Amino acid sequence: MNYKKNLLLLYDRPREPIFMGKGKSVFDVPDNYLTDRYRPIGPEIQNRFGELAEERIPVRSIALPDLRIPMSLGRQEQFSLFIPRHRKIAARLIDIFMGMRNIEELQSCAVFARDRINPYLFNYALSVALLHRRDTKNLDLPSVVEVFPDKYVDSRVFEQIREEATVVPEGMRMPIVIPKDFTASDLDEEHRLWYFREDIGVNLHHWHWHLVYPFEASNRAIVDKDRRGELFYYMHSQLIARYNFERFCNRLQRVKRLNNLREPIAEGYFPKLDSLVASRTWPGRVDNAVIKDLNRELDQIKQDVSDLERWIDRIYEAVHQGYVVDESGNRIFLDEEKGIDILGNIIESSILSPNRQLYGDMHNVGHVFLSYTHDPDHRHLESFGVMGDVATAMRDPVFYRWHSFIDDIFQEHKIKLPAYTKSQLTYEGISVTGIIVQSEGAPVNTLHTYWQQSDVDLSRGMDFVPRGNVFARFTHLQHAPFQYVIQIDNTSDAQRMGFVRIFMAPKNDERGQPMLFRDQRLFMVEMDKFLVALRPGANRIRRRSNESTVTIPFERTFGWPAHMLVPKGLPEGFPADLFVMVSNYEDDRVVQGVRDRLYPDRKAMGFPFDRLARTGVDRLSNFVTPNMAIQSVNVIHIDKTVPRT
Amino acid sequence: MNYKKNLLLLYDRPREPIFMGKGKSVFDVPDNYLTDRYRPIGPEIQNRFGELAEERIPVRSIALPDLRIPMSLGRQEQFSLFIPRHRKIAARLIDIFMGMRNIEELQSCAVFARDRINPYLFNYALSVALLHRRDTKNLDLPSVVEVFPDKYVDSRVFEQIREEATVVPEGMRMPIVIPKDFTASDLDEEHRLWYFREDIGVNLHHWHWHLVYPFEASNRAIVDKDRRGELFYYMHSQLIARYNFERFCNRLQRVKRLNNLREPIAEGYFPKLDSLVASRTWPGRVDNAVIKDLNRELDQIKQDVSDLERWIDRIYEAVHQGYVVDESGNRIFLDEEKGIDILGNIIESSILSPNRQLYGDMHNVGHVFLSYTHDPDHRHLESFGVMGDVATAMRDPVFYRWHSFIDDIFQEHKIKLPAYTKSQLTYEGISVTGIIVQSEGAPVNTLHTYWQQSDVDLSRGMDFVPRGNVFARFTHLQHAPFQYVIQIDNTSDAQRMGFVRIFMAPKNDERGQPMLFRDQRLFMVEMDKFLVALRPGANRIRRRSNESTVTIPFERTFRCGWPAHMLVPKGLPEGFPADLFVMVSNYEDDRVVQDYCGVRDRLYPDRKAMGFPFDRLARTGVDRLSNFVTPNMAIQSVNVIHIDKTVPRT
Ligand SMILES: [Cu+2]
Ligand SMILES: [Cu+2]
Ligand SMILES: [Cu+2]
Ligand SMILES: [Cu+2]
């Protein structure tokens, strides 16, 4: 019905009151729905904004549960899911929206609440409700860039957009270029990774992943998605693999973990963002900032660094011991199957953790500590830095250090698992004899990258700005389209089903030597995984880059961003090993890419390379079984700006 | 294509050679496909049976893997999946059929093999392949009663069917009545349970359950179905709950477990079956037979009773300890979630058992011991009794004693789990205020049962019998149709999703008082479990007996779940008092996303343990059902009346 489309109007201009009229419509709000500020002049308003609209949406006056808790968070305050208190507020609001029987009462509850609670919080609470309420399925939620551009764009543009929109008539408006590589100069070598850390695409992917797999909400089934623990491990683990790749393409070494929390943090980061909702800017972190004990009475944070250290010490112990202990006192064993999944829930701290009280909230609390170095006891009445919000956390370099550490902890369980036997990763009969890649107008086994401007309408997000279009020009990494061509022999006499698993790693190390397996296995980034039917004899499989199951199409973002599928490489060319494996789909099958049910692969995530090598294996070229293939690829960057065409 | 329909012709007349022509068709078999006996007279045969056939199916000559192992089992021998050796033979044949490229070779391999290997084995191996192969989905396999009636019918009828078919012309043939209550007289009080033990329906359900959820070495993909261990526990556990119900309706006490294996078995059983494939009869077991150490060199069985006892001693230890140990030496914990599932695989010995070598093959080996009391060292060259075949095991009373024991072991784990808290089984907002049942022409809260003859065409199964129809008349328990009517209040302000869980148990004890929970919880039989959407305020839910998720209709079981006609216990002529119970649980917690009862092909659609409200002990203060209840539950006194009359099928 219309109702579904009418809720989407709530996302329009989040700070403009709901009675101001969104798109080609306007809401006919009761007077008891007006805020205390505006209610005493309600007559002057409803009339003043009503016209020039094709529709007037009526809204029925309902009972409405107490909205005290939802309204506890200030309107001009920041909202983060990492802060203990906010979690309880959001989870309560989510509960209200979720608890509205009809799609009409959801519209009524929403319309009332919208102008009383924190915009950032509202957006989250609604987003979560719509996606998991049963009436509002298969919907198109507007990109959070378009509703909250302040979390994605240098604050400098805002006063240009205001100028352009006020001075120049519609149709003659110039697109606003969004600054790139703007957070640090060349004195900071970290500035080179702007195209990854600060890319709109990857920041959206991270935000959205945490939307669909929350770690604590209310009602366990929403949190309890198949293998979400392992997902949390793997997804974040791939972020760093990809980051470490991009590091090598900018003449840097692999990211160093946060060894220990007492030592200073070398790399500072000023994000250059200005929250229009908080009307303040996000604080920066200086070079050689030190983590400090938190005492944020308001936010309900009373945590010492030693608490964090204690959690880590215990988690390590469990991992080495090989088992954990639940609240009850019983032991649960970190086996080959569910071990990783358990560990994930323990480490991030999802309510699925078998003993939150003992093993703590290790990952999340780390995000808060790192974001509050500048004001840990709230004496300066300052908010958290960028690492305190999932939406912005990936912008900071320290993210990769903290997430690097966390990964090492997971590793110190994976290295305990028994090596995959020759048997276990052989497909009797199947043999892959070669894989290549081809781009139009480029040699074989060669990938190209470059810069590319794209346009986004940030009009819905620009509150109290003259209506019209406001196009912004993003510059971001892009790769030329390509396709894999895989030669597979059956030699069985029957149709064989198989999973094609494609990863890519660097060929050598930072010192220029052909990488060993122990090293290289951790640098393999997944590129594709798809099901294929093989006829007896010979099969030529072809797969386009845009068919990738790791990626989501550009149009959707505006899943990992498509333009970020290929590492940057170097102008002189960057050498890389492309790897493919065909596994026996009958074993890997899940009787029942992203998936809203169960995860469609029985094998562990990162399956060929998650575990250590079997004895005698030393490098990739002798790890291989017949049903695998390696290929030298060369990744060439070109510093030029292509259009979108 | 046609090929799918052509394989179904293999099931036709299992002992008639494949070149004799099945249904309205006949196979055009190569001469190298003929048997050594018939090869030298091929010229005379292909021609002789070519006549009267509409279609002629060609068959291409292929290589054909070595069929030595499949052919090791004699043609006139019995076949059981419990016997270690047979498992290896079948698993190998399954492997051959499974490994054939196209459905042109599946048909070719089959056609060749069919007349060289044991019919019972062939049927199994094919059934398994078809049910789990790629091209052959949704294919309706003929009822195993129709292909092998010898496992389901008193041997006496066979010489009547032969007489009738030879003497009387088609169309004028009288339906052959199948004897009921024929295995024992009234001196044996056990004879009363014929309508359950010997019912075609329940024996088919058991056979089929083991088809779709094997434990067999085979391949891990086929055996590893979601929670099959818990399934094995629950399904068999419900068999005994239902059996114990039917016992109470025949003035008998609850089934006594097999305490210890050294003491005699009081209840003998002569099954009165004659295997036309083995051309012999199944042996009986005498009263006060004792289990004896097996030494069946041929079958590859060298097991002592003490071995069994040792496995039991160890399993008990693990259950009390609260954990098991895998081959590697690590400890795996029998937790609230997966504990039961693990234990199931350990006890039956499914290849999924985390340590077969230590905890043994306890359930299966028990079936063999009990079936070989009459000839344990093979000195008398006799085959196993009825307990040695899944197809027939439920006919013997000892089945329920052995399966009763096994259940007690599972229980020993369940009583360690923490009681469900008031919180855990409350649905905040939902309140069930009443449940009733209504049958056409009968007071409220009253169920009726009776006898009913039905007809089945056993024509496909009657080898070397003049072609035509051969209808057999089965007498079996039946219940009058009914429907539940459940009054549920929402009081929330939002549409609430809920699982309706319906069980039924006996009302009072031996002394005539309300049964206590500790006792009654184990006698609750599942009657239905279905999803329901509740509007704010008041909701009147109605559910027909024939919509039950525990059951499958008549049509299926005569051409899979529990037979529909066996859904209701028999009750008494004077009326049998019973507590009907319903619970509405919060489906959001119980949901298993996903796009029934015992057999579901997909993952199991319920996060809660099987049995749910009654699998665990009572929380403190609870004592009987009427104070176990939460608002979202309801109890109702039902009365089950039997009437000794034979209704027609209409
Ligand atoms: Cu994250
Ligand atoms: Cu993080
Ligand atoms: Cu069984
Ligand atoms: Cu059994």
Short mmCIF file of all heavy atoms in Angstrom, two decimals, chain A residues 99 101 105 134 219-221 224 330-331 333 337-338 493-494 497 586 589 591 596-598, chain B residues 101 134 221 331-333 337-338 493-495 497 536 587-589 591 593-595 601 603 607:
data_model
loop_
_atom_site.label_atom_id
_atom_site.label_comp_id
_atom_site.label_asym_id
_atom_site.label_seq_id
_atom_site.Cartn_x
_atom_site.Cartn_y
_atom_site.Cartn_z
N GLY A 99 6.79 -3.33 18.06
CA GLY A 99 5.61 -3.79 18.76
C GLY A 99 4.30 -3.17 18.25
O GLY A 99 3.25 -3.43 18.83
N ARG A 101 1.36 -3.24 15.97
CA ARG A 101 0.68 -4.30 15.23
C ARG A 101 0.51 -3.98 13.74
O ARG A 101 0.78 -4.84 12.90
CB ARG A 101 -0.73 -4.53 15.79
CG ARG A 101 -1.57 -3.25 15.81
CD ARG A 101 -2.50 -3.01 17.00
NE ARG A 101 -3.91 -3.44 17.04
CZ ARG A 101 -4.88 -3.09 16.21
NH1 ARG A 101 -4.69 -2.12 15.33
NH2 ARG A 101 -6.05 -3.70 16.28
N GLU A 105 -0.30 2.21 12.49
CA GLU A 105 0.08 2.65 13.83
C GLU A 105 1.59 2.90 13.90
O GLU A 105 2.04 3.77 14.66
CB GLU A 105 -0.35 1.65 14.91
CG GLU A 105 -1.85 1.41 14.95
CD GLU A 105 -2.37 0.56 16.08
OE1 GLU A 105 -1.54 0.03 16.85
OE2 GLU A 105 -3.63 0.48 16.18
N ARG A 134 7.26 -7.57 9.80
CA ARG A 134 6.85 -8.54 8.80
C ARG A 134 6.04 -7.91 7.67
O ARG A 134 5.98 -8.50 6.61
CB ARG A 134 6.08 -9.69 9.45
CG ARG A 134 5.93 -10.85 8.49
CD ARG A 134 5.15 -11.98 9.15
NE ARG A 134 6.04 -12.84 9.95
CZ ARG A 134 6.02 -13.02 11.27
NH1 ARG A 134 5.18 -12.35 12.05
NH2 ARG A 134 6.84 -13.91 11.80
N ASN A 219 15.26 -9.84 22.16
CA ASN A 219 14.69 -10.93 21.38
C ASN A 219 15.82 -11.53 20.53
O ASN A 219 16.33 -11.00 19.53
CB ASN A 219 13.44 -10.46 20.62
CG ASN A 219 12.40 -11.54 20.48
OD1 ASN A 219 12.19 -12.29 21.44
ND2 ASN A 219 11.75 -11.64 19.33
N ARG A 220 16.23 -12.74 20.95
CA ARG A 220 17.52 -13.34 20.67
C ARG A 220 17.63 -13.78 19.21
O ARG A 220 18.72 -13.80 18.66
CB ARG A 220 17.64 -14.58 21.57
CG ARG A 220 19.05 -15.07 21.83
CD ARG A 220 18.95 -16.43 22.51
NE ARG A 220 19.99 -17.38 22.09
CZ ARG A 220 19.81 -18.69 21.87
NH1 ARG A 220 18.67 -19.27 22.20
NH2 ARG A 220 20.79 -19.40 21.36
N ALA A 221 16.47 -14.08 18.60
CA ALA A 221 16.41 -14.52 17.22
C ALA A 221 16.91 -13.47 16.26
O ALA A 221 17.60 -13.88 15.31
CB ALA A 221 15.01 -14.93 16.89
N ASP A 224 20.48 -13.70 16.84
CA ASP A 224 20.89 -15.07 16.58
C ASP A 224 20.65 -15.48 15.12
O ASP A 224 19.73 -16.20 14.81
CB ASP A 224 20.20 -16.01 17.54
CG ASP A 224 20.75 -17.44 17.57
OD1 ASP A 224 21.74 -17.68 16.85
OD2 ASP A 224 20.20 -18.26 18.31
N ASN A 330 29.72 -24.94 33.69
CA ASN A 330 30.00 -26.03 32.76
C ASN A 330 31.03 -25.60 31.73
O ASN A 330 31.24 -24.41 31.53
CB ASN A 330 28.75 -26.48 32.02
CG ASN A 330 27.56 -26.65 32.93
OD1 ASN A 330 26.45 -26.25 32.57
ND2 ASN A 330 27.79 -27.25 34.09
N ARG A 331 31.64 -26.57 31.04
CA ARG A 331 32.64 -26.34 30.02
C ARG A 331 32.08 -26.60 28.63
O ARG A 331 31.44 -27.63 28.41
CB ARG A 331 33.84 -27.28 30.15
CG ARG A 331 34.65 -27.11 31.43
CD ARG A 331 35.88 -27.98 31.37
NE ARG A 331 36.73 -27.83 32.56
CZ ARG A 331 37.83 -28.55 32.79
NH1 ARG A 331 38.24 -29.45 31.92
NH2 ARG A 331 38.51 -28.35 33.91
N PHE A 333 33.39 -26.80 24.53
CA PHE A 333 34.65 -27.08 23.86
C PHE A 333 34.73 -26.37 22.51
O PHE A 333 33.82 -26.49 21.69
CB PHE A 333 34.90 -28.59 23.71
CG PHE A 333 35.46 -29.20 24.99
CD1 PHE A 333 34.63 -29.35 26.10
CD2 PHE A 333 36.80 -29.58 25.11
CE1 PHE A 333 35.12 -29.90 27.28
CE2 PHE A 333 37.28 -30.10 26.30
CZ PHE A 333 36.45 -30.25 27.38
N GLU A 337 34.25 -27.14 14.48
CA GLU A 337 33.02 -26.73 13.80
C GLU A 337 32.54 -25.38 14.34
O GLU A 337 32.47 -24.40 13.60
CB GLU A 337 31.98 -27.84 13.96
CG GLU A 337 30.79 -27.68 13.02
CD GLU A 337 29.59 -28.56 13.33
OE1 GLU A 337 29.07 -28.45 14.47
OE2 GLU A 337 29.16 -29.33 12.45
N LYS A 338 32.21 -25.34 15.64
CA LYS A 338 31.53 -24.21 16.25
C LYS A 338 32.48 -23.36 17.09
O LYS A 338 32.10 -22.28 17.51
CB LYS A 338 30.36 -24.68 17.13
CG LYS A 338 29.06 -24.98 16.40
CD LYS A 338 27.93 -25.40 17.33
CE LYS A 338 26.67 -25.72 16.56
NZ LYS A 338 25.52 -25.94 17.44
N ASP A 493 33.03 -39.48 -15.58
CA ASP A 493 31.99 -40.13 -16.38
C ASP A 493 30.60 -39.70 -15.90
O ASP A 493 29.60 -40.17 -16.41
CB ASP A 493 32.09 -41.64 -16.44
CG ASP A 493 33.25 -42.21 -17.26
OD1 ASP A 493 33.37 -41.84 -18.46
OD2 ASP A 493 34.03 -43.02 -16.71
N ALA A 494 30.55 -38.78 -14.92
CA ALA A 494 29.29 -38.26 -14.40
C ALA A 494 29.41 -36.75 -14.19
O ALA A 494 30.51 -36.24 -13.97
CB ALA A 494 28.94 -38.98 -13.12
N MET A 497 29.20 -31.68 -9.44
CA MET A 497 28.95 -30.37 -8.84
C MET A 497 30.18 -29.93 -8.06
O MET A 497 30.86 -30.75 -7.44
CB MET A 497 27.72 -30.41 -7.93
CG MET A 497 26.53 -29.62 -8.42
SD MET A 497 26.22 -29.82 -10.18
CE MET A 497 24.96 -28.57 -10.46
N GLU A 586 28.92 -31.45 -2.90
CA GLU A 586 28.05 -32.38 -2.21
C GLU A 586 28.33 -32.34 -0.71
O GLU A 586 27.41 -32.40 0.10
CB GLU A 586 28.20 -33.78 -2.79
CG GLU A 586 27.01 -34.70 -2.49
CD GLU A 586 26.58 -35.59 -3.65
OE1 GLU A 586 26.03 -35.00 -4.60
OE2 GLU A 586 26.79 -36.83 -3.61
N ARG A 589 27.54 -28.53 0.47
CA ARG A 589 26.16 -28.11 0.24
C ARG A 589 25.46 -27.86 1.57
O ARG A 589 25.73 -28.57 2.55
CB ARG A 589 25.43 -29.20 -0.55
CG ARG A 589 23.94 -29.00 -0.80
CD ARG A 589 23.28 -30.31 -1.23
NE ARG A 589 23.91 -30.93 -2.40
CZ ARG A 589 23.89 -32.21 -2.73
NH1 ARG A 589 23.24 -33.09 -1.99
NH2 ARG A 589 24.51 -32.63 -3.82
N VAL A 591 21.77 -27.99 2.58
CA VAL A 591 20.40 -28.36 2.28
C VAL A 591 19.43 -27.42 3.01
O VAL A 591 19.36 -27.41 4.23
CB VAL A 591 20.13 -29.84 2.62
CG1 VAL A 591 21.03 -30.38 3.72
CG2 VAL A 591 18.68 -30.13 3.02
N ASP A 596 19.60 -14.54 3.89
CA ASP A 596 18.67 -14.18 4.95
C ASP A 596 18.23 -15.38 5.78
O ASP A 596 17.41 -15.19 6.69
CB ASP A 596 17.40 -13.55 4.39
CG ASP A 596 17.58 -12.12 3.89
OD1 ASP A 596 18.55 -11.87 3.13
OD2 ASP A 596 16.75 -11.28 4.29
N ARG A 597 18.68 -16.59 5.42
CA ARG A 597 18.30 -17.79 6.14
C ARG A 597 19.55 -18.26 6.87
O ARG A 597 19.83 -17.79 7.95
CB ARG A 597 17.66 -18.85 5.24
CG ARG A 597 17.07 -18.32 3.94
CD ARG A 597 15.55 -18.26 3.87
NE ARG A 597 15.05 -19.48 3.23
CZ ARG A 597 15.33 -19.91 1.99
NH1 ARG A 597 16.10 -19.19 1.19
NH2 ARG A 597 14.88 -21.06 1.55
N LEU A 598 20.23 -19.25 6.31
CA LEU A 598 21.44 -19.87 6.83
C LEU A 598 22.57 -19.61 5.84
O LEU A 598 22.31 -19.38 4.64
CB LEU A 598 21.24 -21.39 7.02
CG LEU A 598 20.87 -21.82 8.45
CD1 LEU A 598 19.61 -21.21 9.07
CD2 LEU A 598 20.84 -23.34 8.46
N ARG B 101 26.44 -42.22 -14.18
CA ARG B 101 26.31 -40.95 -14.89
C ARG B 101 24.89 -40.41 -15.16
O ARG B 101 24.48 -39.36 -14.66
CB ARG B 101 26.83 -40.97 -16.33
CG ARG B 101 28.20 -41.60 -16.43
CD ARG B 101 28.13 -42.94 -16.99
NE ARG B 101 27.40 -44.01 -16.29
CZ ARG B 101 27.92 -45.19 -15.95
NH1 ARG B 101 29.10 -45.59 -16.40
NH2 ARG B 101 27.23 -46.03 -15.19
N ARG B 134 19.99 -37.14 -7.97
CA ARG B 134 19.90 -35.76 -8.42
C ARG B 134 18.72 -35.57 -9.38
O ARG B 134 17.91 -34.65 -9.31
CB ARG B 134 21.20 -35.45 -9.19
CG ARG B 134 22.50 -35.74 -8.45
CD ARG B 134 22.62 -34.95 -7.14
NE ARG B 134 23.08 -33.58 -7.42
CZ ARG B 134 22.42 -32.43 -7.23
NH1 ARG B 134 21.19 -32.43 -6.74
NH2 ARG B 134 22.98 -31.30 -7.60
N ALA B 221 27.11 -37.15 4.07
CA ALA B 221 26.09 -36.25 3.55
C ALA B 221 24.70 -36.81 3.78
O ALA B 221 23.82 -36.09 4.28
CB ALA B 221 26.39 -35.97 2.11
N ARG B 331 37.08 -33.85 25.42
CA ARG B 331 35.79 -33.98 26.08
C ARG B 331 34.75 -33.09 25.41
O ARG B 331 35.01 -31.93 25.14
CB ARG B 331 35.82 -33.52 27.54
CG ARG B 331 36.68 -34.37 28.45
CD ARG B 331 36.52 -33.91 29.88
NE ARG B 331 37.30 -34.70 30.84
CZ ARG B 331 37.38 -34.43 32.14
NH1 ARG B 331 36.73 -33.41 32.66
NH2 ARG B 331 38.13 -35.18 32.93
N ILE B 332 33.56 -33.66 25.15
CA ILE B 332 32.44 -32.95 24.55
C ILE B 332 31.29 -32.99 25.56
O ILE B 332 31.00 -34.04 26.13
CB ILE B 332 32.08 -33.58 23.19
CG1 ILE B 332 33.34 -33.70 22.27
CG2 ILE B 332 30.88 -32.88 22.53
CD1 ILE B 332 33.69 -32.54 21.33
N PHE B 333 30.67 -31.82 25.80
CA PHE B 333 29.78 -31.62 26.95
C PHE B 333 28.33 -31.78 26.52
O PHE B 333 27.88 -31.17 25.54
CB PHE B 333 30.03 -30.25 27.56
CG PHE B 333 29.09 -29.93 28.72
CD1 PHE B 333 29.19 -30.62 29.92
CD2 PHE B 333 28.11 -28.96 28.59
CE1 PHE B 333 28.34 -30.33 30.98
CE2 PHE B 333 27.27 -28.66 29.65
CZ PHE B 333 27.38 -29.35 30.84
N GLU B 337 21.42 -28.04 24.75
CA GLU B 337 21.07 -27.85 23.35
C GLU B 337 21.32 -29.14 22.56
O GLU B 337 20.39 -29.74 22.03
CB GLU B 337 21.85 -26.66 22.78
CG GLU B 337 21.33 -26.17 21.44
CD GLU B 337 22.34 -25.50 20.52
OE1 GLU B 337 23.59 -25.59 20.58
OE2 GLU B 337 21.72 -24.87 19.67
N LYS B 338 22.59 -29.56 22.50
CA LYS B 338 23.03 -30.62 21.61
C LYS B 338 23.28 -31.93 22.35
O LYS B 338 23.49 -32.95 21.72
CB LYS B 338 24.30 -30.20 20.86
CG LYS B 338 24.04 -29.40 19.56
CD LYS B 338 25.07 -29.57 18.43
CE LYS B 338 24.47 -29.46 17.06
NZ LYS B 338 25.42 -29.94 16.05
N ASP B 493 -1.81 -5.58 21.97
CA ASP B 493 -1.98 -4.44 21.07
C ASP B 493 -1.32 -4.70 19.72
O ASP B 493 -1.36 -3.84 18.85
CB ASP B 493 -1.51 -3.10 21.64
CG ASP B 493 -2.38 -2.50 22.75
OD1 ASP B 493 -3.59 -2.32 22.52
OD2 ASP B 493 -1.82 -2.20 23.82
N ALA B 494 -0.70 -5.88 19.55
CA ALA B 494 -0.03 -6.23 18.31
C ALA B 494 -0.33 -7.68 17.94
O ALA B 494 -0.61 -8.49 18.82
CB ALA B 494 1.46 -5.99 18.44
N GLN B 495 -0.29 -7.99 16.64
CA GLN B 495 -0.38 -9.36 16.15
C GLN B 495 0.74 -10.19 16.77
O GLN B 495 1.91 -9.85 16.60
CB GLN B 495 -0.33 -9.40 14.62
CG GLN B 495 0.10 -10.75 14.05
CD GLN B 495 0.03 -10.81 12.54
OE1 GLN B 495 -1.03 -10.55 11.95
NE2 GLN B 495 1.12 -11.18 11.88
N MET B 497 2.56 -13.92 16.96
CA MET B 497 2.80 -15.24 16.40
C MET B 497 3.01 -16.24 17.54
O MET B 497 3.61 -15.91 18.56
CB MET B 497 4.02 -15.23 15.47
CG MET B 497 3.69 -15.46 14.00
SD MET B 497 2.24 -14.56 13.43
CE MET B 497 2.01 -15.33 11.82
N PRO B 536 -5.10 -8.91 18.08
CA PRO B 536 -5.39 -8.33 19.40
C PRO B 536 -6.79 -8.67 19.89
O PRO B 536 -7.71 -8.84 19.10
CB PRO B 536 -5.19 -6.82 19.19
CG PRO B 536 -4.20 -6.73 18.04
CD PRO B 536 -4.53 -7.93 17.14
N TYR B 587 6.51 -17.96 19.07
CA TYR B 587 7.09 -18.46 17.83
C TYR B 587 8.36 -17.70 17.45
O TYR B 587 9.18 -18.24 16.72
CB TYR B 587 6.09 -18.39 16.67
CG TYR B 587 6.65 -18.74 15.29
CD1 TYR B 587 7.06 -20.03 14.99
CD2 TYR B 587 6.75 -17.78 14.28
CE1 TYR B 587 7.56 -20.37 13.74
CE2 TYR B 587 7.24 -18.10 13.03
CZ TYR B 587 7.65 -19.40 12.75
OH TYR B 587 8.13 -19.72 11.51
N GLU B 588 8.50 -16.46 17.92
CA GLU B 588 9.67 -15.65 17.58
C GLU B 588 10.93 -16.29 18.14
O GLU B 588 11.96 -16.30 17.47
CB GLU B 588 9.48 -14.21 18.06
CG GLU B 588 10.33 -13.21 17.28
CD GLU B 588 9.63 -11.89 16.95
OE1 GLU B 588 8.72 -11.97 16.09
OE2 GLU B 588 9.97 -10.84 17.52
N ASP B 589 10.84 -16.85 19.36
CA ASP B 589 11.94 -17.59 19.97
C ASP B 589 12.09 -18.97 19.33
O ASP B 589 13.21 -19.45 19.16
CB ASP B 589 11.73 -17.74 21.48
CG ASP B 589 11.76 -16.45 22.28
OD1 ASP B 589 12.86 -15.88 22.43
OD2 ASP B 589 10.70 -16.05 22.77
N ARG B 591 11.18 -19.92 16.32
CA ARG B 591 11.28 -19.86 14.86
C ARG B 591 12.65 -20.36 14.39
O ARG B 591 13.65 -20.16 15.08
CB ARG B 591 11.07 -18.41 14.41
CG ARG B 591 11.23 -18.11 12.93
CD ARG B 591 11.48 -16.62 12.67
NE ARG B 591 10.35 -15.83 13.17
CZ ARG B 591 10.34 -14.54 13.50
NH1 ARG B 591 11.43 -13.81 13.33
NH2 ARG B 591 9.26 -14.02 14.06
N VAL B 593 14.34 -19.72 10.85
CA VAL B 593 13.86 -18.89 9.71
C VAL B 593 13.21 -19.85 8.68
O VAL B 593 12.10 -20.30 8.93
CB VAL B 593 14.91 -17.90 9.16
CG1 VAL B 593 14.26 -16.66 8.52
CG2 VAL B 593 15.86 -17.40 10.24
N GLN B 594 13.82 -20.06 7.52
CA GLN B 594 13.58 -21.21 6.65
C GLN B 594 12.35 -21.00 5.76
O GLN B 594 11.38 -20.40 6.21
CB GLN B 594 13.55 -22.56 7.36
CG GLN B 594 14.73 -23.46 6.93
CD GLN B 594 14.68 -24.90 7.38
OE1 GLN B 594 14.33 -25.17 8.52
NE2 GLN B 594 14.94 -25.85 6.48
N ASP B 595 12.43 -21.51 4.52
CA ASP B 595 11.41 -21.37 3.49
C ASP B 595 10.82 -22.77 3.30
O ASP B 595 10.45 -23.12 2.16
CB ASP B 595 12.04 -20.76 2.24
CG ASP B 595 11.07 -20.44 1.10
OD1 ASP B 595 9.92 -20.07 1.42
OD2 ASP B 595 11.49 -20.52 -0.08
N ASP B 601 12.28 -33.16 5.76
CA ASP B 601 13.41 -33.27 4.86
C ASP B 601 14.39 -32.14 5.12
O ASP B 601 15.59 -32.39 5.08
CB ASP B 601 13.00 -33.39 3.40
CG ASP B 601 14.05 -33.96 2.47
OD1 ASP B 601 15.01 -34.65 2.91
OD2 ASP B 601 13.90 -33.67 1.29
N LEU B 603 15.92 -28.79 7.49
CA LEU B 603 16.24 -28.66 8.91
C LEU B 603 14.97 -28.62 9.74
O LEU B 603 13.90 -28.25 9.20
CB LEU B 603 17.09 -27.43 9.12
CG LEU B 603 18.10 -27.17 8.00
CD1 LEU B 603 18.56 -25.75 8.04
CD2 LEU B 603 19.24 -28.17 8.00
N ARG B 607 13.14 -24.55 17.35
CA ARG B 607 14.36 -24.43 18.12
C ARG B 607 14.23 -25.18 19.45
O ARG B 607 15.24 -25.62 20.00
CB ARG B 607 14.79 -22.97 18.36
CG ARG B 607 15.33 -22.26 17.12
CD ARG B 607 16.44 -21.24 17.38
NE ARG B 607 16.09 -20.27 18.43
CZ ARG B 607 16.58 -20.21 19.67
NH1 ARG B 607 17.48 -21.08 20.08
NH2 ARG B 607 16.16 -19.27 20.50
#
